[PDB]
Design an enzyme around this catalytic site. Structure first.
Site, mmCIF file in Angstrom:
data_model
loop_
_atom_site.group_PDB
_atom_site.id
_atom_site.type_symbol
_atom_site.label_atom_id
_atom_site.label_comp_id
_atom_site.label_asym_id
_atom_site.label_seq_id
_atom_site.Cartn_x
_atom_site.Cartn_y
_atom_site.Cartn_z
ATOM 1 N N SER A 180 0.832 -1.200 0.000
ATOM 2 C CA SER A 180 0.000 0.000 0.000
ATOM 3 C C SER A 180 0.869 1.253 0.000
ATOM 4 O O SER A 180 1.893 1.305 0.693
ATOM 5 C CB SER A 180 -0.917 0.018 1.220
ATOM 6 O OG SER A 180 -1.264 -1.304 1.610
ATOM 7 N N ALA B 38 0.096 5.810 -0.982
ATOM 8 C CA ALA B 38 -0.967 6.804 -0.814
ATOM 9 C C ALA B 38 -1.957 6.721 -1.973
ATOM 10 O O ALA B 38 -3.178 6.665 -1.766
ATOM 11 C CB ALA B 38 -0.362 8.210 -0.689
ATOM 12 N N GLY C 128 -2.672 4.103 -4.033
ATOM 13 C CA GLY C 128 -3.540 2.970 -3.809
ATOM 14 C C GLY C 128 -2.794 1.747 -3.341
ATOM 15 O O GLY C 128 -1.814 1.837 -2.593
ATOM 16 N N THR C 129 -3.249 0.592 -3.789
ATOM 17 C CA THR C 129 -2.749 -0.679 -3.308
ATOM 18 C C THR C 129 -2.407 -1.535 -4.511
ATOM 19 O O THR C 129 -2.992 -1.371 -5.583
ATOM 20 C CB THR C 129 -3.799 -1.310 -2.429
ATOM 21 O OG1 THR C 129 -4.173 -0.341 -1.438
ATOM 22 C CG2 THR C 129 -3.283 -2.552 -1.730
ATOM 23 N N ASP D 108 12.891 7.217 -14.507
ATOM 24 C CA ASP D 108 12.898 6.680 -13.145
ATOM 25 C C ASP D 108 13.448 5.255 -13.111
ATOM 26 O O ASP D 108 12.914 4.388 -12.413
ATOM 27 C CB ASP D 108 11.492 6.726 -12.516
ATOM 28 C CG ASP D 108 11.513 6.618 -10.978
ATOM 29 O OD1 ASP D 108 12.563 6.883 -10.357
ATOM 30 O OD2 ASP D 108 10.478 6.254 -10.382
#
Ligand SMILES: COc1cc2ncnc(Nc3cc(Cl)c(F)cc3O)c2cc1O
Length: 295
Positions: free
Chosen positions: A27, A29, A31-32, A139
């Site tokens: 999890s 911020a 989502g999951t 990234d």
């Protein structure tokens, strides 16, 4: 114009019935991330997947889905589909061993030079493919490489990726310690900017997951890099491997290696790994992996 080619990738909309969540993989911020099974209907296959699921970050995750649906490479993670319920879910092939940064830290006492150099080859292959598709990742890091099996890794997390057309990108929350100096100073990003981040990522593996510039404030990174300072030569690295790493960190982005050349050089090294790394001691029946479900 048609100076660029039409992106005829398919975006597959998946029914919520078609898959079953199983476990919460993690999890944040946003989502999951779940793990689950996707059973395309009347298809008699069960596919192990990861599911990643309303402000206006819906437009952000849809950007990620656009990129993941447009890549197809053994060393890049493909989007399987999206589900458009109350929440927007991305569905991708499950990479059971998780991210390579955690893997390298949990198994550091059982990782041989063959694996390290092979991982290096595979990431250069994926990165070279993204460059072929004119895609700047912005990234690349060990935390964003997934492990399908110990012998097979793939690049993921395309939330920052940008699609150059027909050489640079200009942005306006970023990973400082993986960024080329030009990305810090001028917010310029190039495939050669990614080659820098490739160098930090190799350094992460060769140190078994150390934090780069650990204990240095990110704001001092810019001035430190200008003064001529780079990451230290990891203990297991011959000068041959560390000299490749150093080259990715040259101020002139064009005198840095190309991903196609990094492939060649690490392949040559993976052909005799102990010459280049010195390391002490060198349930269901219709399950189909995603790499074998092609539609
Ligand atoms: C076993 O542990 C893990 C396995 C994973 N297998 C595949 N994908 C992951 N994440 C992920 C998923 C989507 Cl759909 C995306 F768009 C971006 C992503 O990074 C996983 C995350 C884990 O923690």
């Amino acid at each position: 114009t048609s100076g660029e080619a039409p992106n005829q990738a398919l975006l597959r909309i998946l029914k919520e019935t078609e898959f079953k969540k199983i476990k919460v993989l993690g999890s944040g911020a946003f989502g999951t991330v779940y793990k689950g099974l996707w059973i395309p209907e009347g298809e008699k296959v069960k596919i192990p997947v990861a599911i990643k699921e309303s402000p206006k970050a819906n437009k952000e995750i849809l950007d990620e889905a656009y990129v993941m649906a447009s890549v197809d490479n053994p060393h890049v993670c493909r989007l399987l589909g999206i589900c458009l319920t109350s929440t927007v879910q991305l569905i991708t092939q499950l990479m059971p061993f998780g991210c390579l940064l955690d893997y390298v830290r949990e198994h550091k006492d059982n990782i041989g030079s063959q694996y390290l150099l092979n991982w290096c080859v595979q990431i250069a292959k994926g990165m070279n493919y993204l460059e072929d598709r004119r895609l700047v990742h912005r990234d690349l890091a060990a935390r964003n490489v997934l492990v399908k099996t110990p012998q097979h890794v793939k690049i993921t997390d395309f939330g920052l990726a940008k699609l150059l057309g027909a050489k640079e990108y200009h942005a306006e929350k970023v990973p400082i310690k993986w960024m080329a100096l030009e990305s810090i100073l001028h917010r310029i990003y190039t495939h050669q900017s990614d080659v820098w981040s490739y160098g930090v990522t190799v350094w992460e593996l060769m140190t078994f997951g150390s934090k780069p510039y650990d204990g240095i404030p990110a704001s001092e990174i810019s001035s430190i890099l200008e003064k001529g300072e780079r990451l230290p030569q990891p203990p297991i690295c011959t000068i041959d491997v560390y000299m490749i790493m150093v080259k990715c960190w040259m101020i002139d982005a064009d005198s840095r290696p190309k991903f196609r050349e990094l492939i060649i050089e690490f392949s040559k090294m993976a052909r005799d790994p102990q010459r280049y790394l010195v390391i002490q001691g060198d349930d269901m029946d219709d399950v189909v992996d995603a790499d074998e479900y092609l539609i």
